[PDB]
């Protein structure tokens, strides 16, 4: 039996949860730690069809929705792109949130590039591919 594939996914999830935790406790990214509240931003749902935030990323780790770093960074990229699509550039608060969105993306990418073994990631990607096939 090849339970080694599951060992890969277990180690991936532990790594993803640790990365997400480090993003979620960074004061810069507090705005991305909870879903956008339509009571405070009533037009958000009219711009953004696929909302995403760091607490939802945690839930998706728990539910085994990330088999690859690519799948995970897709959701980090979604947090960023939603913020850049939704938020205008009209006052200093707008500029601040947009900068934090890019810094979230860049921080997640930099951590993964520094800390993630390339062969481990490729193995995860290719198990996902074998399971698709």
């Amino acid at each position: 039996l090849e339970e080694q594939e599951e060992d890969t996914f277990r180690e991936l999830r532990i790594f993803l949860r640790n990365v997400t935790h480090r993003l979620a406790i960074d004061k810069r990214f507090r705005v991305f730690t909870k879903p956008v509240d339509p009571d405070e931003v009533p037009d958000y749902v009219t711009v953004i069809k696929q909302p995403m935030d760091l607490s939802s990323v945690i839930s998706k780790i728990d539910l085994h929705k990330y088999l690859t770093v690519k799948d995970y960074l897709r959701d980090i990229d979604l947090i960023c792109s939603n913020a850049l699509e939704y938020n205008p550039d009209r006052d200093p608060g707008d500029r601040l949130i947009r900068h934090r969105a890019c810094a979230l993306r860049d921080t997640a990418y930099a951590i993964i590039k520094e800390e993630l073994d390339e062969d481990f990631e490729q193995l995860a990607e290719e198990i996902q591919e074998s399971r698709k096939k």
Binding site: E40, V41, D43, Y44, T46, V47, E85, Y86, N87, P88, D89, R90, D91, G93, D94, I97
Partner: peptide
Amino acid sequence: SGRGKGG
């Protein structure tokens, strides 16, 4: 883009 979150 939308209204923004400044209120």
